Amino acid sequence: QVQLVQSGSGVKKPGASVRVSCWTSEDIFERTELIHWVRQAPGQGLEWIGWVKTVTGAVNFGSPDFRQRVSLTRDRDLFTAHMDIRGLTQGDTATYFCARQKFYTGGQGWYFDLWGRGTLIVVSSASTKGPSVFPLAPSSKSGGTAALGCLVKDYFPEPVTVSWNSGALTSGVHTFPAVLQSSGLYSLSSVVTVPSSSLGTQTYICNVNHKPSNTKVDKKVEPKS
């Protein structure tokens, strides 16, 4: 199940246009009759956007909105398909996939056997911003286990990476899915459970990296005494 290649994910202001591209090998493109585009909004299902026929450049769409705002083209020489979206709205935030349909499907409908890795497009007027990192301090206070963590708050856009003790600590770690705040900035928690006896005998540090803003932070977490 080889993958088709796609352009990198990115952030676009509302109302902007974007181009997402999808390319593959000569052999594969040659055996592709239609390239379809399908999107999946965060936490939602799959939605067919439209197709373009590789040989003739003919197109079709899943809705008038899509027919209006989306352009589907291809370059047969470069084995590439393009999806241009204009007038980006908040409702357009999604991972966009390109997907291939072979020739000679006959009467057996639509099935896409090769897919691109998908391109995340995030539509937001928010500005790039590094996180503040706050401690989730273990209670000194009957399971012999204690939990601590870091609150990685108010950054944009995704993603951030979090490790503990520079990667030396991986067991018992849970790094949660970021949530999008009404401020338009994300917040994320990472926690780790340890033996209660370990507090005060072992040092725990979360390492936070937010490459978009080139912000990196190391936060020591200890019980509030």
Place this chain on the structure above:
Amino acid sequence: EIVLTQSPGTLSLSPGETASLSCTAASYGHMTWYQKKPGQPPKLLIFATSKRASGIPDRFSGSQFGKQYTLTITRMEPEDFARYYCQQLEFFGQGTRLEIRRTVAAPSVFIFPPSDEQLKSGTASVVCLLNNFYPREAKVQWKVDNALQSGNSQESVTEQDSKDSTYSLSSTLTLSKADYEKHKVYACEVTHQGLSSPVTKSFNRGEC
């Protein structure tokens, strides 16, 4: 009307068991089925209703009873737990989430007050953690001086753990520094099938 109806919405099974998913279509039409894991694109499993895609192991099968199109996975492997979608022409089913069934486990619950650092900045985030529980269904209720808080909380839940089949959940209650200063008792109340009654973790503002 609706062109495709997929069911069940959720399916909990043990490795080695067989899963039966169906997509009931308004009209006859060859059905397609994909597997979908987080951060990865759909993978073709079945097409033309019953034909297996290249490289797909024979434990995956498709068929139909009239307009009821079905995907069967016998003797499930760990790797087979994921979301599944049917596709008939341009339409996709709502999806089925197939997760690993284990015995019920009650969460360990922890509460974290806001840091002094954060307070200085005018904001207080209070965090409640539900750790390593099953099933995934759980309810967190926040209370401040016995007043039920609503609309000022957000939560996040992890993907089922690959090794112990449990879930963990984090909930953040966010208030202004001033509102935090105006109250004393901060409580997180957790409801869960593994708990014979709701557990409450609390702290008193400004107490060691």
Place this chain on the structure above:
Amino acid sequence: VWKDADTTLFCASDAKAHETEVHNVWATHACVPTDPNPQEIHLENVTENFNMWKNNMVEQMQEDVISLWDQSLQPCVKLTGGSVIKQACPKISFDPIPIHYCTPAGYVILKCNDKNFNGTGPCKNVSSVQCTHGIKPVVSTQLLLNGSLAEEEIIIRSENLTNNAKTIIVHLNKSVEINCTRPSNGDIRKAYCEINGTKWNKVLKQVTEKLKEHFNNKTIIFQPPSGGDLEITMHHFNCRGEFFYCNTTQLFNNTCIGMKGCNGTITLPCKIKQIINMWQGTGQAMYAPPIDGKINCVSNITGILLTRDGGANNTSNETFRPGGGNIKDNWRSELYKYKVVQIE
């Protein structure tokens, strides 16, 4: 006793050995004389299934027409991938002739004579023939030209009407003349096609009435193509060796169907193009400018190629746009009633 099978066909024609016209030259070599005594045999009480979209005769005709164009209409400049080929590209005599397709020994062709047969499924009135009827290999997009007509009602053809990636073929039961001219000298590439507005609109109204039957009496709407190469966004065809591209926007005018300011002659603007995309799918070709004089082809519109808009699930209407591009569909439009079987 017989069964569905595929085999190597041969062709037959009335080609003239003295003729310089290129279809004649090709068929003089490739084909035998037309059956001097064609006889079909009705198969009493016989029902047979057909599938026009999975008919290997279509593939063999496509191969012939590709071969014919390859040796008679070679471009002065061929651009395939990145490599440039330069070769001679003299003007030629060009006018399609009827070609018959015939089965070898031990095989026969079954012919469906149901008057409203749509190309797939059971056929109740079946006969056997040695050769198809004479089919002109007219290459065109959007409109099928100089073909045969549905004998009873207008017929809608599709591999799967609900599959919006499948082209729909409308088979007319009354042809409408289209009269295309590049006048003698001036823009040598400017041309036009004239069509009788009244006749065309009446046909197109009947087409919508037939379409309503297949889409639950929903409202039927035509629109111009939304994208693609010029060969498909326009009515593309070859007249006297020259490649025409005509704008059909006026041809699919909803306002007329159902007002009366439409009756009268419809003039479609066309252009002759030296640089084209080859329908063969083999890339871009460049030809020499058009010959001098009055370039004129009068043709019968006997079919229409359509693509239906997606996204109309829960809408009150259905929208169609002219299509084409896959020339095998052109041959299907004529071969639909035939299939090869092997005599056991």
